[PDB]
Amino acid sequence: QFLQWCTLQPENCAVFTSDNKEMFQTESGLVVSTYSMVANTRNRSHDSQKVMDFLTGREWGFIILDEVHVVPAAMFRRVVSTIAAHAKLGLTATLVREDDKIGDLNFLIGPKLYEANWMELSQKGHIANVQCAEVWCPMTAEFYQEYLRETARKRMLLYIMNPTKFQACQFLIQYHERRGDKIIVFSDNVYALQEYALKMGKPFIYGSTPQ
DNA sequence: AGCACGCTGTGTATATAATAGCTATGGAACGTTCGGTTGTACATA
User: Between the CA of A63 and the C1' of B36, what is the distance in angstroms?
Assistant: First the structure.
C-alpha cells in the first residue's frame, strides 16, 4: 500500500517480519514490523537481535501504530517507550477493550484527534451497506439434552456443532454463491472450522498456517 | 623296339608398310566390410 499510493522507492523499505529481517542501510528509510517482533523481551534470535538494535539506536521521526486498541496490553505498551520518536499516531476502526486499559492510551500516544461516523460514510459511497442479520437455529432435541448436563467449557463445542447450523450455513452459502458473491465464514473455534471446511470441500485458514 | 643319325620346322636378329584387336596405365567414382516441540503473549471466562 505504501509503495502503490506514494512515491516511496522500494530500496528504502524494509519489512521486519519472521520471514525476512534485512534492514535498509540508506540514510533515511522505512520499517514496517509487528508488535510480536518488537515487543519481545526475553528470547531474541541472533538474526533478530541486530535488527532490534538497529531500530533502537536510531531516533525515529514517526511511528504508525495500526490497530492501536492492542497497544495498552501488558507488554505491547513497552514498545511505545523503547522506540524513540517525536510523533506517534494511532489507527484503529474500534477503540474498545474489555478491560479498563483503554484510557491508558492518553499518556501513551496522546489524545483522540478525530472520529468519523459509520452511516455518514456509508451513504456517501465510501463504505458498503450491510444488512446485518441474526439467524435463530433452534437446537435439535437430541443435542439440546446434553447441553443441560455438560459443563461450561464443553457446552461451547456442543452448541457450535448442532446440525441445524450446518444446514443453515450450507443453504446460505449455496444461495449467495449463485448470486455471484464472495463469502467468508469466520469461526474462532478451530475444530468446527476444519469440520465445516472438510465437509464442504473449501479452503480454510487458522493460526498454524505458514504465511 | 631302342639308339644313332639325317631332315625339317621353330625361335632369335634386322629393316619396312599396312590393320584391327586387345592390353597396360593413370584418373574417377561407388558399394561392401572391418575397427516438531517450547515458551511467552494475548484475549476472554
Answer: 36
